[PDB]
Amino acid sequence: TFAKIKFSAQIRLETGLHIGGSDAFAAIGAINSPVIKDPITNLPIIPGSSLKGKMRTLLAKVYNESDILSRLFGNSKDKRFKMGRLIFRDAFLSNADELDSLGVRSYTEVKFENTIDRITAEANPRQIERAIRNSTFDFELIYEITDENENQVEEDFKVIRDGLKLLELDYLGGSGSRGYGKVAFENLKATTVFGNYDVKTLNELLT
Amino acid sequence: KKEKIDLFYGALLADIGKVIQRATGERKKHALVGADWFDEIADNQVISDQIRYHMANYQSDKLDHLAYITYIADNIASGVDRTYTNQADIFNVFGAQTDKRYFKPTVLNLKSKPNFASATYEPFSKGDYAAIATRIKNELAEFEFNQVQIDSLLNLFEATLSFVPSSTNTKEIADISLADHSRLTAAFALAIYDYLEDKGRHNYKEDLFTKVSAFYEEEAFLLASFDLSGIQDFIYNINIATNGAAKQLKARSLYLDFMSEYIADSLLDKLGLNRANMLYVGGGHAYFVLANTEKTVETLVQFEKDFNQFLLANFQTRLYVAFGWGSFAAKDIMNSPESYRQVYQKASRMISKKKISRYDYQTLMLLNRGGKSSERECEICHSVENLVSYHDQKVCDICRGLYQFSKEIAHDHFIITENEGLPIGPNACLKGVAFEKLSQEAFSRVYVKNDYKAGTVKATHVFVGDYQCDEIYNYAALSKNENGLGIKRLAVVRLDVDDLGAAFMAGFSQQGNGQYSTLSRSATFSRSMSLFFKVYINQFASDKKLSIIYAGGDDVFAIGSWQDIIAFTVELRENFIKWTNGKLTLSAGIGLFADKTPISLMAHQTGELEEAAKGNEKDSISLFSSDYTFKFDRFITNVYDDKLEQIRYFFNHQDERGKNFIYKLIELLRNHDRMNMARLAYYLTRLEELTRETDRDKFKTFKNLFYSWYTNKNDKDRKEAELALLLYIYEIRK
Amino acid sequence: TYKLYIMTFQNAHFGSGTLDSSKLTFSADRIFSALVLEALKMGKLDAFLAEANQDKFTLTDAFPFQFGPFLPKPIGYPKHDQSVDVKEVRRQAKLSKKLQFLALENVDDYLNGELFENEEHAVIDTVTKNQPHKDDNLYQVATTRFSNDTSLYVIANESDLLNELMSSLQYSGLGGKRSSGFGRFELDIQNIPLELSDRLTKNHSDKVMSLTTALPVDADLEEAMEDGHYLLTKSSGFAFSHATNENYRKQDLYKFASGSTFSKTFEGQIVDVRPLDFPHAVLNYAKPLFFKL
Ligand SMILES: [Zn+2]
């Protein structure tokens, strides 16, 4: 049978983020590596392609030997799995005012940084724009239930929740091997919208 | 067409005595001088008797003879019913009124320094004309009259007679050169002859000499025009990660220019006309003068339908030629202003109606006929037909001929064969070729690019913006000087004339009562602007380390090393206001880019910079960013030559303050609250007495000046200091 | 012809034959193909197809809803109805090229002659992406990030199956990269104004605007292009399927883009653009729902 069961969550940074975007001119003082934002609100974001790729590249290290990642995320060549079983979304910074209620001035910090040669011992400085610590982001993840979907949904959820177990151990962001990660998940509820399929056995697999 | 040729030669080559009797000082009327001197190079009574009896004020009672057409084509080729001054520049009656500048009467070359006009060239110089006059005798030395020799004569005028005045003893029609007066005369003459000899009128003494006032208001001229829609979104068909980076942009902008030239060529031989009838060709649009018969209208409709079948055959609704003609009698001569705008309005709205009602029933029923299986596509143009495996990928036909054309683009001659290279017509395929390889192939027409010589095969001279100092990937490494004094970047400037369409629709009707927007001045201004933006950009960019990718019409798109790009924009503006007298402000936008960035992410950011500059004011240069927007009146004088030379004169004398002081200065200029004025007042006064106390007043006259253009409170003298320090830190980066 | 379906997108990628670009509408074949592709997971395909072979429902491509409904510019109109300011007739040339959308309350005022300096909704951004440590790993997806007050409304005929499918598209995405964020909306069916509901004809023969990309029957096309002021569209692309194991192209369809005026209204057709030797049909909805200008 048919349903769509989304995965609501607040995503919480415990170190910063860095997700870059199209390169722009840096007028000296200006930051060399600006974070991607929302062009309407001028507010940071995690684009949905940066989570669909980061979770897939993380589960490809776990479920390497391919036929379950391909049915969860998609595979263009295989006829069974073009556009199959998952839809992500952006991450729209829910606590834009709990940051002000915690007391903060601007939503992105500018981490200064450098590079030191091993011959000249000469510096080479960078400025990395970063989404600040303990921001939350409205994360949600549609997982569509269909006819071919049936009888394997039990191993689409010890993988999705084995995937969100991985993002709290790998970085989710650029320059993640120097901090810039440590994404945590909270309020990880699995409701249901447009469907007749209960979720109240799944909701204790997560929480 | 057996007696059209000598008609063209006579009604063109009359008033060519008007260089002889201006070089020898003879008061004989030109109709006799030119007809006399023409007999001592070639023998033709059908040309010399046309030069002889065109004036109808010395002697006429000997003819009928193709003289009367030769008469009346001269009487419509002036704005009126037609002593030691030169040729007036065109912009004395363009828009505003400034000092009237006048042309030094010289010829034209290829490595020529430009030909700016001043007010101090107003009295004549008869002695200047000799290097002109023998140029007409020798280059036309062994001359004949046929469709081979029909065309290399015309470039023979535009290398020499481009700056020779016409009818010196009058005041109104003044800024029209001989190499447009004669071109319009011979343009009109063939139109009169086609209109008359279509309708079976075989005598001219009673229809063109005494009943000239009645045919003069008979609707006999089709001001035709066309427009090639889809040019800009054909040139910019390139995405990120594209193999042919900018050679496939040079090649595409030359392909569309030769297509828009081959339409204006292959139209007039479907008709009985030549390259004199075309009043202007250029950025898609091209304006002609044809005869007002049905033999031109059905040939126009047939040719437009066949060429659009040709365009649907390979491009599939990416390009579209739209034609349109406005009919008029000989009444654009002074309802004087509302007769010229009207006939240009008619072809404008015919093109606009034809832009919007594209095809007929059968072609669009064909266009989605189906039956077309596919599994691959050309990743460039998303076409299906003729896919091959060029460089381990699938390409189409046109994006294979384009790589062949980008190899051939560095030559001089481009011949139109039937099978080789890029198709630009119905069974006409373009191919670039060297000079010596012309013998083995069999052309039908040949375009020689940016030349003025007589040519081997009596070719057709076309113009293009062309320069290439080095390769695109070498341009960031070339920016480092002979000390390492540069940042390793490469800049891109997309210039643009501001309000070019406002300079062509109204253009001249600002001065006067609608009496100066006429045909001759419009064609002269159009040839002047194409002569600037296609020929003379190579002179301004002769020594520099850049590469003018695309140039002309208004728009210029030039990659290059960044110091040379900025100096090239400076020289182009400081020569375009010398050219167009301060009228026609242009607007550049420069963007600084690292190496190996793609030239689609580069071109779009520079285009956004450029439209931000156009939206800054009517004129602006937007250096490097969407906030460093200036004016050309202010960037060139104050920023680039006043402030930057003062900062270089101060900093390259001392050996104490280094890059750190400049970086903190830019930081205080960029942050900028009011409190930073006090912080800078503390900083400069603290550093004033920290110096070596011998050379302190160097720093004192610098710091008083810097605090003078921090706290000036005009908002126009602060961003200049910030950008001047950006350019200095760029210049001194190791 | 009944109530319009307000969709609140907040981000979308809408084609124009590239990946680097983005339309603002979606030409109504996108919404019909989304309905057909979602009603195959529910197995409600042939019910919707036998519903689609009727005049029981008509569709209509999207226009902005900035606190009021919008329509395309009447292409070709206003006809020739003043010589003044030959300077200023070039000013609105470059700012009515991007007009392309007018509200109801002035769409009959525009033909009488007015300006409507075009509003800004949905700035079309463009952002680079990669596929890191791999062979060819840069592309560019042009988001249409919507300006917080704008909605794309599809004008339909309200059926309960159509409500089911249009409510599944709240969460199944509608657009370019649906599986990576874009084109995901919220639905809220609203009221058609009384001045709008009377005017969506399908048979009234006068000077009448189109409101979708519709292709006539081949009989009527001859005078459908006699005095129509239209565009062409080139609706094509890959035929998304599950029974191929390769990726095939559709059959290269040209269409009359929304905004196309016509005298003497026609009837459209679901032009089957199925590839050669292909299992299931590929429909490409082209039938019009007009606007009596
Ligand atoms: Zn192509």
3-state secondary structure B372-426: CCCCCCCCCCCCCCCCECCCCCCECCHHHHHHHHHHHCCCCEEEEECCCCEEEEC
Cβ–Cβ below 8 Å for C179 and A147: no
Question: In terms of Cα–Cα distance, which of B669, B688, B681 is closest to B729?
Answer: B669
The gap from C-alpha C271 to its chain's centroid, in whole angstroms, comes to 16
Cβ–Cβ below 8 Å for C229 and B364: no
Q: Is B211 on the interface with C (CB under 8 A)?
A: no
The letter for the amino acid at C73 is K
Q: Give the pair of three-digit tokens for residue C215.
A: 């292709």
Cα dist from A117 to A114, A120, A177, B480, whole Å: 10, 6, 19, 22
Ligand 1 mean position to B76 CA, how many Å?
A: 46
Across the interface, of A22, A23, A27, the residue whose CB is closest to B625 is: A27
Neighbours of B498 (CB within 10 A): 17
C283 vs B49: CA distance, rounded Å: 73
Q: Give the pair of three-digit tokens for residue C24.
A: 């603002």
* Cβ(B216)–Cβ(B192) below 8 Å: no
C57 vs C63: CA distance, rounded Å: 19
B182 vs B161: CA distance, rounded Å: 10
Tell me how the structure was determined.
cryo-EM
User: In the 8-state DSSP scheme, what is residue B641?
Assistant: I
Task: Report the neighbours of C using a cutoff of 3 or more CB pairs below 8 angstroms.
Answer: A, B
The gap from C-alpha B442 to its chain's centroid, in whole angstroms, comes to 30
Cβ–Cβ below 8 Å for C184 and A22: no
Cα dist from B412 to B156, B415, B420, B428, whole Å: 18, 10, 17, 19
Give the resolution to one decimal, in Å: 3.6
Question: In terms of Cα–Cα distance, which of B515, B523, B561 is closest to B334?
Answer: B515
Task: Report the neighbours of A using a cutoff of 3 or more CB pairs below 8 angstroms.
Answer: B, C
The letter for the amino acid at A198 is D
* Cβ(B646)–Cβ(B717) below 8 Å: no
Cα dist from C111 to A105, B42, C78, whole Å: 51, 64, 5
C146 vs B317: CA distance, rounded Å: 30
Residues of B in contact with C260 (CB under 8 A): none
Neighbours of B522 (CB within 10 A): 20
Terminus-to-terminus CA distance in chain B, angstroms? Answer: 70
Question: In terms of Cα–Cα distance, which of B529, B562, B545, B721 is closest to B644?
Answer: B721
The gap from C-alpha C29 to its chain's centroid, in whole angstroms, comes to 7
Terminus-to-terminus CA distance in chain C, angstroms? Answer: 17
Neighbours of B57 (CB within 10 A): 8
For the CA atoms of chain C, what is the radius of gyration? 20
Across the interface, of C168, C170, C242, the residue whose CB is closest to A80 is: C242
Residues of C in contact with A76 (CB under 8 A): 247
Q: Is A102 on the interface with B (CB under 8 A)?
A: no
Q: Give the pair of three-digit tokens for residue B49.
A: 């008797």
B117 vs B103: CA distance, rounded Å: 5
Residue of C91, C254, C262 to mutate when probing chain B, most B C-beta within 10 A: C254
Helix (H) / strand (E) element for A184: namely: strand A183-189
| DSSP per-residue letters across chain C | -EEEEEE--SS----TTSSS---SS-TTHHHHHHHHHHTTTTT-HHHHHHHHTSTT-------BBSSSBEE---BT-S-------TTTTTTTHHHHTTT--EESTTHHHHHHH--------SEE--EEEE-TTSSS-EEEE--EE--SS--EEEEE---HHHHHHHHHTTTS--SSSGGGT-S---EEE-PPPHHHHTT--SS--SEEE--S-B-B-TTTHHHHTTS-B-----B--B---SS-SS--B---B--B-TTBEEES---B-----PPTT-SS----------EE-
Dihedral pair phi/psi, residue B415, rounded to 5°? -105, 150
Cα dist from B20 to A94, B9, B15, whole Å: 85, 18, 9
Residues of B in contact with C222 (CB under 8 A): 361
Order across the sheet with B589-593: list the strands.
Answer: B546-551, B556-560, B490-495, B589-593, B622-623
Residues of C with CB under 8 A from a CB of B: 17-18, 20, 75-76, 80, 83, 86-87, 89-90, 93, 126, 128, 136, 138-140, 215, 218, 221-222, 225, 228-232, 234, 236, 246-249, 251-254, 271, 273, 275-277
User: In the 8-state DSSP scheme, what is residue B293?
Assistant: S
The letter for the amino acid at C90 is R
Number of residue pairs across B and C with CB atoms under 8 Å? 88
Cβ–Cβ below 8 Å for A28 and B594: no
Helix (H) / strand (E) element for A8: namely: strand A8-13
Question: In terms of Cα–Cα distance, which of C67, C82, C71, C75 is closest to C96?
Answer: C75
Neighbours of C157 (CB within 10 A): 17
Q: Give the pair of three-digit tokens for residue B528.
A: 């002047």
User: In the 8-state DSSP scheme, what is residue A188?
Assistant: E
Q: Give the pair of three-digit tokens for residue B730.
A: 């760029």
Ligand 1 mean position to B383 CA, how many Å?
A: 7
Neighbours of A114 (CB within 10 A): 9
B651 vs B659: CA distance, rounded Å: 10
User: In the 8-state DSSP scheme, what is residue A73?
Assistant: T
Please tell me the distance in Å from B312's CA to the nearest CA on chain A.
33
* Cβ(B235)–Cβ(B253) below 8 Å: yes
What is the DSSP pairing of strand B422-425 with strand B428-433?
antiparallel
C54 vs C43: CA distance, rounded Å: 20
Residue of A88, A93, A148, A197 to mutate when probing chain C, most C C-beta within 10 A: A88
Positions of E strands within B419-545: 422-425, 428-433, 446-449, 460-462, 490-495
* Cβ(B595)–Cβ(B562) below 8 Å: no
Q: Give the pair of three-digit tokens for residue B56.
A: 């109808």
**What share of residues in chain A are helix, strand, coil (percent, to 5)?**
20, 20, 60
The interface residues of chain B toward chain A in range 593-622, judged by CB-CB distance below 8 A, are: 594, 597, 601, 605
Q: Give the pair of three-digit tokens for residue B375.
A: 């599994």
Positions of E strands within B640-714: none
Neighbours of C137 (CB within 10 A): 11
- Number of separate helices (H) and strands (E) present in chain A: 5, 9
The gap from C-alpha A109 to its chain's centroid, in whole angstroms, comes to 19
Q: Give the pair of three-digit tokens for residue B194.
A: 């086609």
Helix (H) / strand (E) element for B521: namely: helix B519-530
Please tell me the distance in Å from A203's CA to the nearest CA on chain B.
44
Dihedral pair phi/psi, residue B537, rounded to 5°? -70, -25
Question: In terms of Cα–Cα distance, which of C279, C284, C281, C283 is closest to C245?
Answer: C279
* Cβ(B79)–Cβ(B172) below 8 Å: yes
CA atoms within a 13 Å half-sphere pointing along the CA-CB vector of B459: 22
Residue that the structure tokens 């300077």 belong to: C87
Cβ–Cβ below 8 Å for A28 and B726: yes
For residues C220-250, b (16+ Cβ closer than 10 Å) or e, as one string?
ebeebbeebbbbbbbbbbebebbebeeebbb
User: In the 8-state DSSP scheme, what is residue A144?
Assistant: E
B167 vs B83: CA distance, rounded Å: 9
Residue that the structure tokens 């201006």 belong to: B22
Cβ–Cβ below 8 Å for C147 and A40: yes
Dihedral pair phi/psi, residue B442, rounded to 5°? -130, 95
Question: In terms of Cα–Cα distance, which of B32, B247, B42 is closest to B144?
Answer: B42
Helical axes B5-13 vs B67-76, angle rounded to 10°? 50
B568 vs B548: CA distance, rounded Å: 10
Task: Report the neighbours of B using a cutoff of 3 or more CB pairs below 8 angstroms.
Answer: A, C
B364 vs C215: CA distance, rounded Å: 11
Please tell me the distance in Å from B399's CA to the nearest CA on chain A.
27
- Which residues make Cβ contacts (< 8 Å) with residue B224, sequence separation at least 6? B287, B288, B289, B290, B296, B300, B323, B324, B325, B326, B347
